[PDB]
Amino acid sequence: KGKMAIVISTLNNPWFVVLAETAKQRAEQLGYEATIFDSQNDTAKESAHFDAIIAAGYDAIIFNPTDADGSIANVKRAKEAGIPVFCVDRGINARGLAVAQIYSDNYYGGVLMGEYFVKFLKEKK
Amino acid sequence: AKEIPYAELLGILSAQPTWDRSNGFHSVVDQYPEFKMVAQQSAEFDRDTAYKVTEQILQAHPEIKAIWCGNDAMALGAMKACEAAGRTDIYIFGFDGAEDVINAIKEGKQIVATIMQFPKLMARLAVEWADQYLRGERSFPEIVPVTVELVTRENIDKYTA
């Protein structure tokens, strides 16, 4: 019982659509209400959404920040409001504000592709 | 091949994933001196920019045998540019696991590998951890990397089942 705000940086590409609909669906599977807020790649629109989200008394924010610097103020305002923030895919350049920042291991994947690059092309030559 | 020339499409130069992916790749490839990166250029993680850059690359360095791309959108643009030039011989490698690259790999086009991310799992994890938090949990790492997997012609059926 409670509600989560799914704050997505944009919906102009299928990657972010998948993130947003999946978080909303999972929140509802776990007994929460959830709503998607599209920032349309605009930190001012993101901030306005945070205003609405705080005013509406949401219990948690699932956050895909528009800007790793520009979005800190917004997470700071959620923190001051008492609303925990969980970042997904993109993060913020501040520590101790969001509870967690979840992202894909880009360096590790680079190591995996370098290995196969050499193997594949060594075979083909 | 005593020398094997290749090109690299970087992502947006100002974005750290460009460099985590590129530096991960080069931390391996550079220890094999037969591989010579003959062209390196940003295509801004963008499909249509990758077409235009690859087009310029192919008329400048036709000796390349492979193109490594910092993401799949860029690999898709490079493929369309290769086919337009007739350069169907060039092996293209990407990153993300985008459906369009997955389909290109399984149908035997010149894109031959990518790195699978799991965005549904990370979106669900943020929700699952919020749930745990609202239920009382306060012990969470702040920086949470989620792992990835290599996708090849040889294991593609694991990713299309």
Side-chain angles (χ1 to χ4, degrees), chain A residues 2-75 77-78 80-121 124, chain B residues 1 4-35 37 39-51 53-55 57-58 60-64 66-79 81-98 100-105 107-108 110-153 155-156 159-161:
Chain A
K3 52 177 192 296
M4 323 183 169
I6 318 291
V7 178
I8 196 70
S9 67
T10 183
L11 290 176
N12 75 1
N13 154 284
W15 167 267
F16 299 98
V17 170
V18 168
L19 289 170
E21 72 204 354
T22 298
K24 190 187 179 300
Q25 181 185 33
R26 192 57 174 151
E28 283 169 17
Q29 294 179 354
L30 306 191
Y32 296 94
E33 275 166 35
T35 295
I36 290 161
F37 298 81
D38 178 12
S39 297
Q40 319 193 262
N41 278 314
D42 194 324
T43 306
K45 302 199 171 160
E46 176 187 287
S47 322
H49 295 345
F50 266 73
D51 292 337
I53 283 160
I54 293 148
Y58 274 80
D59 303 283
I61 296 161
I62 313 298
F63 188 32
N64 175 245
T66 50
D67 193 79
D69 292 309
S71 302
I72 293 169
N74 285 325
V75 187
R77 305 201 281 111
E80 274 165 282
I83 309 179
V85 169
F86 294 79
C87 291
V88 53
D89 172 49
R90 319 161 146 240
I92 54 169
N93 289 327
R95 303 278 127 108
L97 297 184
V99 178
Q101 305 192 45
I102 295 152
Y103 67 101
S104 208
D105 200 335
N106 287 313
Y107 194 85
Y108 183 44
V111 176
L112 310 166
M113 183 57 80
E115 306 178 337
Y116 190 74
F117 193 77
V118 165
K119 176 174 172 112
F120 185 93
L121 293 167
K124 293 292 188 290
Chain B
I4 170 184
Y6 73 96
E8 172 173 30
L9 298 183
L10 296 164
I12 302 160
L13 298 180
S14 66
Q16 204 183 311
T18 290
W19 298 108
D20 284 343
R21 297 179 185 188
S22 177
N23 289 338
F25 177 93
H26 282 281
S27 78
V28 170
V29 169
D30 292 358
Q31 318 183 0
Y32 299 85
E34 60 264 50
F35 299 92
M37 165 175 84
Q40 185 189 48
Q41 174 166 4
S42 186
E44 328 287 339
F45 281 135
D46 180 67
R47 174 137 150 76
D48 290 358
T49 303
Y51 176 92
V53 170
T54 310
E55 199 178 20
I57 294 330
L58 295 169
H61 295 277
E63 80 263 17
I64 59 169
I67 309 165
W68 145 242
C69 307
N71 80 347
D72 280 344
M74 281 212 307
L76 287 161
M79 185 175 65
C82 285
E83 312 182 333
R87 291 313 290 270
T88 46
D89 60 307
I90 288 172
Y91 299 112
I92 296 169
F93 308 70
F95 197 123
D96 275 348
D100 275 350
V101 158
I102 295 294
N103 287 330
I105 295 171
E107 304 167 9
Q110 63 198 113
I111 298 172
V112 307
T114 194
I115 298 295
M116 196 35 90
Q117 304 178 264
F118 296 89
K120 300 201 222 161
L121 303 188
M122 23 186 180
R124 293 176 187 145
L125 189 65
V127 171
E128 282 146 0
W129 280 15
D131 180 34
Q132 292 176 32
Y133 182 98
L134 294 171
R135 292 174 176 262
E137 179 68 71
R138 285 303 174 279
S139 289
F140 297 94
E142 183 174 353
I143 301 298
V144 193
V146 173
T147 196
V148 296
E149 284 185 341
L150 178 76
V151 185
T152 72
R153 260 171 190 184
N155 70 7
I156 191 43
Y159 300 89
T160 46

